[PDB]
Design a protein around this ligand. Structure first.
Ligand code: BPN
Ligand code: ZN
Ligand code: ZN
Ligand code: ZN
Ligand code: ZN
Ligand code: ZN
Ligand code: ZN
Ligand code: ZN
Lengths: 222, 219
């Protein structure tokens, strides 16, 4: 089991620098090239650079010379990418990947990818979210089934973690992508259950905002 | 740098039918060693990209042979012989013949299914929120198809355009439907000055607007 684990989301101030890490396991780290790729606003990928950890040899896309510096620590099987003097265009998700092309064979081995690291370049302050329970009035769906909701608003920056009944309730839940407005994000989630489950047994919304060390559970009461 | 052009931008196909994606490059991708380094990747919703094909037509291990690749020079095509639900996502062609490596813009593949009418739920502000001096009215429009839908808020019969925040999910891989959330935020004081709050939608599944509303009051 070959695995690449990347570091967590970063909020960086304009003009500063960040070092992203990509820890690997399950294969001989020094024998394969590690590439870094950038993704902005969904479909929009760009190739940054590649490094051969065995020798330290690196090749950069001209656009990123001076922006990105790749290193790799053989003793820990970790590749790093430092980004310097961050600006608007640098806000993106960055992926590391053991791409798998073997130059000597002129053929490919399976590609393995890290989960991605989201970098947000902003000077806006970190704000904890307010979590509000949404109990039905008309959005009761009548009988048979009923839908409840959870409103998470006024936080910065992304992301927030939202579950229902500690993750025990995953079927019929819809979590909507957060939307930014006036320097604060708002996110919502709905869960549909049978009229027999709720209000009988309790339904709770669990929310976590790492950036502000906030963890809150809201019980949807009638 | 080589410019990679993909078409179409989006394709909607029913499970079981074939689908083909095109990719064109600004320079021939034939390398001086006679090999053509053209790859196809798929990025499933909420996932990292994954290579499906390399060297124009060679499938990567673990990739179903329902997927086929072909082309040469500056024209390439990815074909899916029979579409399955797991094929939903964005497909990209990427070239490694010329430095630096460049990607195409992507083609989103969406599963075409039978029209589904939205299930709409409306929620008045919570006590917790009102205490803070704010009031948000939320409306969920769940499980509809096609994605195309228009929602308007009306307070006491008049349309309200300021203070509306909308969000949509990507196509659901369990039923191929879409869901959306619309939130209207007002001050507590203004919220307490009106009576009827209406969430109104326009969708292919109906010749008249789809409505959900509530009248606030007290008792
Ligand atoms: O995404 N990657 O890591 C890539 C690496 C190399 C190429 C050139 O074929 C394309 C993509
Ligand atoms: Zn091969
Ligand atoms: Zn060239
Ligand atoms: Zn050349
Ligand atoms: Zn009025
Ligand atoms: Zn009036
Ligand atoms: Zn009014
Ligand atoms: Zn009035």
């Amino acid at each position: 089991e070959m695995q690449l684990q990347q570091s967590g989301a970063e909020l960086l101030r304009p003009g500063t620098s960040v070092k992203l890490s990509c820890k690997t396991s399950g294969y001989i780290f020094t024998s394969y090239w590690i590439h870094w790729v950038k993704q902005r606003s969904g479909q929009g990928l760009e190739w940054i650079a590649r490094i051969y950890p065995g020798t330290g040899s690196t090749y950069y896309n001209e656009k990123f010379k001076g922006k990105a510096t790749l290193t790799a620590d053989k003793s820990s099987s970790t590749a790093y990418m430092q980004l310097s003097t961050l600006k608007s265009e640098d806000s993106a998700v960055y992926f590391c990947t053991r791409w798998g092309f073997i130059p000597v064979r002129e053929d490919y081995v399976m590609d393995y990818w890290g989960q991605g690291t989201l970098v947000t370049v902003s000077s806006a302050k970190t704000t904890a979210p307010s979590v509000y329970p949404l109990a039905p009035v008309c959005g009761d769906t009548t009988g048979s089934s009923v839908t409840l909701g959870c409103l998470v608003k006024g936080y910065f920056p992304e992301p927030v973690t939202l579950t229902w009944n500690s993750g025990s309730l995953s079927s019929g839940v819809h979590t909507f992508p957060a939307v930014l407005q006036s320097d604060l994000y708002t996110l919502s989630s709905s869960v549909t259950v049978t009229s027999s489950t709720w209000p009988s047994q309790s339904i709770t919304c669990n929310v976590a905002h790492p950036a502000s060390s906030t963890k809150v559970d809201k019980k949807i009461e009638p | 740098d080589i410019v990679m052009t993909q078409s179409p931008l989006t394709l909607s196909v029913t499970i079981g039918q074939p689908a083909s994606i095109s990719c064109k490059s600004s320079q021939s991708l034939l390398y001086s060693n006679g090999k053509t380094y053209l790859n196809w990747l798929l990025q499933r919703p909420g996932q990292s990209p994954k290579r499906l094909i390399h060297l124009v037509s060679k499938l990567d291990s673990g990739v179903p042979d329902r997927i086929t690749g072909s082309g040469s020079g500056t024209d390439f095509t990815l074909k899916i012989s029979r579409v399955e639900a797991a094929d939903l996502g964005v497909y990209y062609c990427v070239q490694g013949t010329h430095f630096p490596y460049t990607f195409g813009g992507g083609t989103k593949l969406e599963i075409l299914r039978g029209d589904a009418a939205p299930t709409v739920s409306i929620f008045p502000p919570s006590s917790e929120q009102l205490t803070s001096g704010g009031a948000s009215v939320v409306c969920f429009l769940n499980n509809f198809y096609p994605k195309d839908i228009n929602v308007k808020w009306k307070i006491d019969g008049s349309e309200r355009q300021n203070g509306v925040l909308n969000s949509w999910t990507d196509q659901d891989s369990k039923d191929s439907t879409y869901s959306m959330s619309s939130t209207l935020t007002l001050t507590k004081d203004e919220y307490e000055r009106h009576n009827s709050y209406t969430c109104e939608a326009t969708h292919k599944t109906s010749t008249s607007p789809i409505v959900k509303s509530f009248n606030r009051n007290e008792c």
